[PDB]
Structure prediction request, 324 residues.
Amino acid sequence: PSPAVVGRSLVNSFKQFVSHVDATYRLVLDCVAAVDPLMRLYTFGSTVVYGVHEKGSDVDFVVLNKTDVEDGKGGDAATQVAKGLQADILAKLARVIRQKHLSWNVEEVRRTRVPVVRVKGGGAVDFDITAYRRNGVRNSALLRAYFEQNPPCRWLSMSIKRWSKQTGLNASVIGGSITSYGFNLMVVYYLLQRNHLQFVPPSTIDVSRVEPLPPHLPLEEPADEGLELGTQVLDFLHFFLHEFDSDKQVISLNRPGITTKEELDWTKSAEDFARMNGEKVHYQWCIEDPYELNLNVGRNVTPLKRDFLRRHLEKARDTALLTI
Ligand SMILES: O=c1ccn([C@@H]2O[C@H](COP(=O)(O)OP(=O)(O)OP(=O)(O)O)[C@@H](O)[C@H]2O)c(=O)[nH]1
Ligand SMILES: O=c1ccn([C@@H]2O[C@H](COP(=O)(O)O)[C@@H](O)[C@H]2O)c(=O)[nH]1
Ligand SMILES: [Mg+2]
Ligand SMILES: [Mg+2]
Prediction:
């Protein structure tokens, strides 16, 4: 197709999306007050990034203490004790949520690097609780900060996210490699390279100044019937197929300009020594975490999943990201 055609099939595909989180936030703070009344609740993830709440999206919360919040720029420990601490306080809160809401499924998730409690209410009321981590709110505010720069870019984002679940690329789907977060990191990196955004050093995001529940950010329709959205997609996909060099480069918001794998020691050699969650890390598709230490966000992109990613980045160019 063409920028225009793509733009219209996309605005068309979102048209019933354009047709209240405080209540959940409140519901949840109930259970935290019960565990410890001095304990803060922070919202993060797409709600906070986009300033809007989508259907098919959950809500991400983290429970923090006063001093975790005042240490607004501290890192998150990746020690075993940190993980012990976080699991101890999320077991109690889970116990409390179950004990206040019998219909709800409260699953204490332990597969992960980051201990999380997963809650389904049935009423498509969904959410994840984590404890004692700042990086979650820090990177969402960092991505929020950027999206406020150029608010219509949220459409490029939402368009990429939805397609990634649909393609089976998103970490939410079996066989998926990159989280929704990882994809936002690409959207932004791309827009940076192309000058639609101004660089914001990650270290200026100060948790002691973020809002626990930030204000809504009106999402408005593309007022050119999609031409800007359409030409950005066609270009985003061109950027990742023909401009970004996955063998020598790292998608990163840590520096403006290029970051190489060489300078990070994200190399073949590294892979042999590397391990994350009692398992291999891959350095095929490299996405540098703004805040975590030496964490590649596409560590699951096996040499084969890098095939599918290229495979899909090409089909998406002729299917308007699966809409026509
Ligand atoms: O590898 C990860 C994944 C997630 N996160 C933290 O979790 C937040 C939400 O993680 P999600 O990947 O669930 O993304 P999302 O909420 O933007 O979109 P949906 O797929 O839910 O519609 C992210 O924005 C980030 O703060 C990480 O820090 N690292
Ligand atoms: O670095 C991370 C990774 C995960 N999570 C939380 O745990 C859930 C599952 O993580 P993942 O399995 O998508 O990596 C996410 O929705 C999010 O709330 C984080 O806060 N930080
Ligand atoms: Mg989420
Ligand atoms: Mg998630």
